[PDB]
Amino acid sequence: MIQRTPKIQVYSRHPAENGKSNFLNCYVSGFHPSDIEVDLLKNGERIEKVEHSDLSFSKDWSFYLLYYTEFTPTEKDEYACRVNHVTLSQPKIVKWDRDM
């Protein structure tokens, strides 16, 4: 039984300008098995109409999903990705850093 925790990247589709239309992406990759919970959070509360790509995988058989939602960023609005997987005892939260 292989068990690999997901690599998590939280990023916008386009370079973020406060008050400009954009997409918030949470990319989870390199995990096994495929069962995974992903939420996008606005200020620690859960965003509703979050869409995700169809389950696919890499040459090494590890899975990757993209979770995305339309958003307009502002200075005081902080966004995070929350991930749970069989490899994690407790959900993992990764803050969106518009520089990273």
Next chain:
Amino acid sequence: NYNYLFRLF
């Protein structure tokens, strides 16, 4: 195009 046939292990 998907292939037509799939075999049991």
Next chain:
Amino acid sequence: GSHSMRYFSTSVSRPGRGEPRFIAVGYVDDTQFVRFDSDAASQRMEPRAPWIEQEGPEYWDEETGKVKAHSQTDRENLRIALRYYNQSEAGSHTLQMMFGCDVGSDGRFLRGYHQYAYDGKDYIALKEDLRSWTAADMAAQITKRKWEAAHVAEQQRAYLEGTCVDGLRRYLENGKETLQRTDPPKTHMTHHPISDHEATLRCWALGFYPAEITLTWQRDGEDQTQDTELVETRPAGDGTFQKWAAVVVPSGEEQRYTCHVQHEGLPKPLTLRWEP
């Protein structure tokens, strides 16, 4: 240059909470064009690219049939691996499959693939010659002996050299606008002080297709593969890709470091120096 078609299937058992979930997904290069999800309301092979919707209703009927068949088979293959490996009926298990073909600039068949993995490990695979099998362990030997006897290699080789290349060639024509396009990366650099001694130089590449790219750091013109952080290429969500590479530079030596971007879409490799 090569083009490629791949179908990726995942079957996941879940004793007590139904029958196996089966998700299948088709790609031409780095572009998804179809899907099937045994949990999708539709229960059809659905389009995921503009240019596939071009296909007649006879395509969608024949393709839905073939993938539902795959679904039912890999469902039984989860039961068989369970017996071969002597595993409890309590545990959830994964069976993944990958098949497809590559064609050259000319539409000439180049190579083909037919591979299974059970619980994230290689199980059985058609070798490069499309005539023989690699079995990862004793359970797969059993499948190998079965398939050697039933001439399954010859059957698969037929599909890989025929229907698979015929389809890929049809898609590369109908999706020419999209699939034979070359979106070059939009580049920039960022600076992030880590300590009093060191800082991170990050080289960004955004909105590029295909996903194949090389970001390399050079110090005084010599390659700095040691101490380069490279993140997995990631999807923007619009069919283009993003990637970055980083080095921890001794603070006050930023000018000694240049970033090199290589991509199918660039006439020449791009160079970026740190500019305050």
